[PDB]
XYZ file of C-alpha atoms in Angstrom:
365
model
C 0.000 0.000 0.000
C 2.843 2.518 -0.433
C 2.160 5.975 -1.902
C 4.927 8.260 -0.529
C 4.280 11.560 1.344
C 7.850 12.847 1.221
C 6.997 16.568 1.353
C 4.292 19.071 2.145
C 5.433 20.715 -1.068
C 4.526 17.823 -3.338
C 1.389 17.240 -1.288
C 0.159 20.677 -2.353
C 0.760 19.879 -6.008
C -0.625 16.328 -5.662
C 2.902 15.031 -6.233
C 3.122 15.807 -9.934
C 6.493 15.695 -11.631
C 8.281 15.379 -8.303
C 11.174 14.079 -10.374
C 11.818 17.392 -12.120
C 10.718 20.248 -9.888
C 13.419 21.458 -7.479
C 12.188 24.495 -5.547
C 13.152 22.929 -2.217
C 15.227 20.026 -0.842
C 12.371 17.512 -0.759
C 12.669 16.339 -4.342
C 16.113 14.754 -4.136
C 14.427 11.868 -2.322
C 12.531 11.489 -5.615
C 15.384 11.885 -8.087
C 18.943 12.125 -6.755
C 20.023 13.686 -10.086
C 18.169 16.797 -8.856
C 21.043 17.263 -6.359
C 22.839 19.087 -9.173
C 20.118 21.752 -9.009
C 21.261 23.300 -5.725
C 23.705 26.216 -5.334
C 24.087 25.757 -1.590
C 23.268 23.573 1.448
C 19.489 23.264 1.617
C 17.312 21.844 4.364
C 13.681 20.987 4.685
C 11.626 19.146 7.259
C 8.030 18.669 8.338
C 5.150 16.245 8.544
C 1.892 15.339 6.846
C -1.263 14.634 8.854
C -3.486 11.893 7.389
C -7.145 11.816 8.472
C -8.636 8.741 6.742
C -12.225 7.531 6.527
C -12.438 3.851 5.618
C -15.696 1.967 6.125
C -16.564 -1.667 5.442
C -20.100 -3.038 5.188
C -22.058 -6.125 4.220
C -23.380 -9.204 5.996
C -21.801 -12.604 6.721
C -23.614 -15.713 5.535
C -23.798 -16.517 9.247
C -26.227 -13.615 9.516
C -23.884 -11.485 11.583
C -22.950 -7.974 10.421
C -19.662 -7.217 8.655
C -20.033 -3.480 9.204
C -16.962 -1.634 10.505
C -16.775 2.177 10.522
C -13.568 4.218 10.383
C -11.136 1.270 10.350
C -8.155 3.483 9.461
C -6.537 5.591 12.261
C -5.273 9.158 11.721
C -1.506 9.387 11.419
C 1.388 11.818 11.195
C 4.185 11.148 8.730
C 7.406 13.134 9.235
C 9.965 14.125 6.635
C 13.420 15.669 6.579
C 15.782 16.333 3.676
C 19.201 17.890 3.235
C 21.088 18.514 0.018
C 24.485 20.157 -0.455
C 26.924 20.914 -3.254
C 30.238 19.098 -2.833
C 31.918 20.373 -5.978
C 31.135 21.968 -9.334
C 30.369 18.520 -10.733
C 29.269 16.734 -7.519
C 26.724 16.931 -4.729
C 25.104 14.667 -2.124
C 21.996 14.489 0.049
C 20.103 12.403 2.616
C 16.501 12.081 3.656
C 14.158 10.422 6.125
C 10.731 9.513 4.839
C 8.035 7.205 6.172
C 4.898 5.344 5.153
C 2.224 4.194 7.601
C -0.498 1.616 6.893
C -3.056 1.172 9.704
C -6.236 -0.935 9.796
C -8.167 -1.716 12.990
C -11.216 -3.943 13.468
C -12.835 -4.957 16.763
C -11.582 -8.362 17.931
C -15.225 -9.486 18.071
C -15.748 -8.627 14.388
C -17.540 -11.318 12.368
C -15.083 -10.875 9.506
C -12.341 -11.312 12.077
C -10.303 -13.958 10.226
C -9.460 -11.277 7.634
C -10.101 -8.254 9.818
C -8.407 -7.872 13.168
C -5.696 -5.225 13.039
C -2.936 -4.566 10.534
C -0.008 -2.280 11.280
C 2.683 -1.638 8.748
C 5.033 1.275 9.473
C 7.922 2.065 7.114
C 10.913 4.333 7.550
C 13.194 5.202 4.678
C 16.725 6.345 5.339
C 18.235 7.586 2.077
C 21.783 8.541 1.252
C 22.680 9.567 -2.264
C 25.084 11.349 -4.581
C 24.732 13.092 -7.918
C 27.068 13.911 -10.817
C 26.377 16.628 -13.396
C 27.960 15.669 -16.728
C 27.430 19.053 -18.366
C 24.806 21.767 -18.820
C 21.976 19.408 -19.751
C 22.581 16.034 -18.097
C 22.802 14.970 -14.440
C 22.883 11.490 -12.929
C 22.021 10.510 -9.394
C 22.404 7.334 -7.387
C 20.979 6.542 -3.978
C 21.128 3.838 -1.354
C 18.179 3.219 0.943
C 17.877 1.442 4.263
C 14.239 0.640 5.084
C 12.991 -0.074 8.592
C 9.781 -2.145 8.628
C 7.615 -2.719 11.685
C 4.663 -4.984 10.921
C 2.092 -6.280 13.419
C -0.747 -8.526 12.241
C -3.647 -9.901 14.254
C -6.391 -12.219 13.052
C -9.349 -13.761 14.882
C -11.952 -16.468 14.276
C -14.971 -14.303 13.556
C -18.118 -16.317 12.929
C -16.095 -19.073 11.211
C -17.143 -21.614 13.852
C -20.693 -20.429 13.348
C -20.283 -21.119 9.632
C -18.793 -24.575 10.181
C -21.548 -25.217 12.743
C -24.292 -24.270 10.333
C -22.534 -26.250 7.607
C -22.558 -29.351 9.815
C -26.243 -28.999 10.718
C -27.307 -28.937 7.056
C -25.443 -32.172 6.332
C -26.851 -35.609 7.269
C -24.589 -35.437 10.332
C -26.818 -32.657 11.666
C -28.944 -35.351 13.244
C -26.581 -37.061 15.641
C -25.657 -36.607 19.270
C -22.232 -36.589 17.621
C -23.079 -34.353 14.689
C -24.939 -31.732 16.704
C -22.228 -31.846 19.372
C -19.555 -31.137 16.756
C -21.507 -28.177 15.385
C -22.001 -27.008 18.990
C -18.273 -27.241 19.625
C -17.613 -25.258 16.437
C -20.297 -22.666 17.237
C -18.749 -22.497 20.704
C -15.573 -20.871 19.389
C -15.373 -17.286 20.570
C -15.219 -14.762 17.732
C -12.349 -12.977 19.482
C -10.141 -16.088 19.635
C -6.807 -15.034 18.143
C -6.148 -17.139 15.054
C -3.014 -15.272 14.000
C -0.348 -13.162 15.675
C 2.757 -11.685 14.081
C 4.825 -8.657 14.990
C 8.325 -7.975 13.773
C 10.928 -5.335 13.081
C 13.197 -5.824 10.095
C 15.463 -3.916 7.719
C 15.431 -3.985 3.965
C 17.769 -2.349 1.465
C 17.640 -1.039 -2.087
C 18.995 1.537 -4.495
C 17.399 4.127 -6.710
C 18.739 6.105 -9.665
C 17.777 9.120 -11.711
C 18.554 10.904 -14.931
C 17.973 14.607 -15.323
C 17.819 16.499 -18.587
C 17.546 20.289 -18.759
C 16.474 22.014 -21.980
C 17.343 25.241 -20.250
C 16.851 26.773 -16.814
C 13.054 26.622 -17.080
C 12.429 23.168 -18.508
C 13.585 19.738 -17.324
C 12.659 16.064 -17.741
C 13.431 12.966 -15.698
C 13.428 9.214 -15.561
C 13.878 7.589 -12.148
C 14.236 3.985 -11.055
C 13.425 2.760 -7.558
C 14.537 -0.803 -6.833
C 12.511 -3.536 -5.144
C 13.095 -3.954 -1.401
C 13.827 -7.150 0.589
C 12.388 -7.074 4.147
C 12.254 -10.780 5.033
C 10.285 -10.562 8.287
C 10.251 -13.074 11.144
C 7.383 -12.776 13.625
C 7.986 -11.198 3.974
C 6.973 -7.668 2.905
C 8.039 -6.405 -0.519
C 8.260 -2.903 -1.929
C 7.975 -3.129 -5.755
C 10.333 -1.576 -8.258
C 9.130 1.800 -9.436
C 9.773 3.666 -12.628
C 8.707 7.219 -13.116
C 8.901 9.859 -15.807
C 8.277 13.519 -15.042
C 8.784 16.943 -16.530
C 8.530 20.564 -15.462
C 7.939 23.689 -17.572
C 8.466 27.212 -16.314
C 6.161 28.510 -19.010
C 6.130 32.019 -17.588
C 7.869 34.083 -14.918
C 4.653 33.537 -12.937
C 3.566 30.051 -14.069
C 5.036 26.561 -14.130
C 3.614 23.174 -15.116
C 4.773 19.803 -13.807
C 3.537 16.281 -14.449
C 4.503 12.617 -14.206
C 3.641 8.997 -14.897
C 4.852 6.179 -12.625
C 4.856 2.393 -12.864
C 4.823 -0.138 -10.053
C 5.367 -3.849 -10.517
C 4.503 -5.956 -7.463
C 0.589 -7.203 -10.293
C 0.820 -3.847 -12.103
C -0.265 -0.270 -11.319
C 0.242 3.209 -12.754
C 0.044 6.702 -11.349
C -0.514 9.852 -13.354
C -0.358 13.341 -11.870
C -0.653 16.845 -13.209
C -0.305 20.182 -11.514
C 0.528 23.841 -11.680
C 2.561 26.252 -9.562
C 1.895 29.986 -9.561
C 4.884 32.068 -8.369
C 2.872 35.145 -7.423
C 5.839 37.140 -6.164
C 8.957 37.060 -3.989
C 7.052 36.025 -0.848
C 4.144 33.903 -2.127
C 3.808 30.865 -4.362
C 0.603 28.892 -4.938
C 0.123 25.332 -6.221
C -2.621 22.896 -7.268
C -2.746 19.292 -8.387
C -4.790 16.317 -9.550
C -3.651 12.698 -9.540
C -4.827 9.190 -10.323
C -3.326 5.863 -9.352
C -4.891 2.674 -10.685
C -4.997 -0.141 -8.119
C -2.154 -2.757 -8.246
C -4.120 -5.613 -6.642
C -6.530 -7.499 -8.994
C -10.297 -7.634 -8.485
C -10.288 -10.646 -6.173
C -6.918 -10.493 -4.408
C -8.182 -7.360 -2.690
C -8.622 -7.418 1.083
C -10.525 -5.279 3.570
C -7.340 -5.322 5.644
C -5.254 -3.305 3.170
C -7.355 -0.299 2.034
C -6.389 0.042 -1.627
C -8.282 0.738 -4.859
C -8.138 3.396 -7.600
C -7.665 6.780 -5.905
C -8.034 10.367 -7.045
C -6.245 13.389 -5.641
C -7.294 17.038 -5.466
C -4.621 19.244 -3.965
C -3.801 22.807 -3.097
C -0.929 24.536 -1.369
C 1.055 27.691 -0.777
C 4.608 28.665 0.187
C 5.564 31.750 2.132
C 9.133 32.950 1.891
C 10.290 34.966 4.897
C 13.320 36.097 2.901
C 15.582 34.120 0.596
C 16.812 31.407 2.920
C 13.616 30.688 4.839
C 10.203 29.442 3.742
C 7.199 27.525 5.078
C 5.078 25.196 2.944
C 1.401 24.442 3.650
C -0.379 21.829 1.578
C -3.783 20.205 1.697
C -5.099 17.201 -0.194
C -8.393 15.324 -0.445
C -8.239 11.747 -1.718
C -11.271 9.629 -2.558
C -11.209 5.963 -3.351
C -13.532 3.895 -5.485
C -16.290 2.045 -3.645
C -15.293 -1.558 -4.358
C -16.753 -4.980 -3.628
C -14.340 -7.362 -1.932
C -14.760 -11.129 -1.858
C -12.332 -12.395 0.743
C -12.684 -15.826 2.341
C -16.335 -16.838 2.725
C -17.307 -13.165 3.067
C -18.417 -10.397 0.744
C -17.888 -6.780 1.776
C -18.286 -3.306 0.350
C -15.353 -0.915 0.868
C -15.390 2.839 0.421
C -12.745 5.272 1.591
C -11.796 8.936 1.470
C -9.058 10.901 3.278
C -7.933 14.395 4.085
C -4.245 15.333 4.218
C -2.512 18.358 5.663
C 1.204 19.121 5.750
C 3.736 21.748 6.745
C 7.418 21.920 5.922
C 10.124 24.375 6.943
C 12.846 25.250 4.433
C 16.279 26.750 4.966
C 19.432 27.475 2.955
C 22.859 28.078 4.520
């Protein structure tokens, strides 16, 4: 379920062309080649607040309800980036990003065997360097260390009630043995833990980027993000990502940025488009729209991992105190597609929306 909230800057533009825009340090975590776009040590840090709304509904064949409101907890995701020129041809940078995936059902939930609670927290420590070959090309390379903390809990919802019913409708449902078996099955508490896993493990990977500048106002990029290991022990895998993006400073006041990304877990593609309006020295305004087509098929979907085609509507602004200090404020509304899930012997209906808010502080030495 990873869609990365690396900056409150991208958040305000719906993360469009994050591989080519370089108005603050955040983007090197997206394309290390962009390191060659900084004249001096630059720093940025902040967090994004995620207020999700994920509801499940339906009814078990046992007759019990499968309704669960607000199964996704609100969360804060922090970010910090630093980029600095090393030489005329070289530069480096590091960043700390994180992805949180939370899903919580009551332990007495009827869909318990696929409900329960799912916690997947990710932390990305990135270290990278970039080399500028000339006036047009730049190449970046980064190494990532990923910290993964996953805790999974599953219960026997009404499963015993299903087996019980199942028994009763078979010829056995007429024996002091048959009925007793179905009674023993039906006698299983719905909050009996049927699965427990919780681990902390590190994964590693590299990412690379190519930058091409037509001039000072137009750039294009291709980035590659490698798949990540993370062999737990209580296996989580982050797919390889490819992305193309471009930015066009069409006017002293207006810029356009956009991108297309590809994830290969199962496929998936993300497309984003946005605009940035540099009003004046102090203010800058941005907007965005994005779409990411779900990676999981139409039957491998689970109510545990909220994930279907999403749409993003964003807005943001940046205030510059002077020329070394600035604050970014970004807001984003995401709305998923109401989808029907068919997991185990159940059939649910999953709809989800979310509101995002972020602030980042920027500084240049």
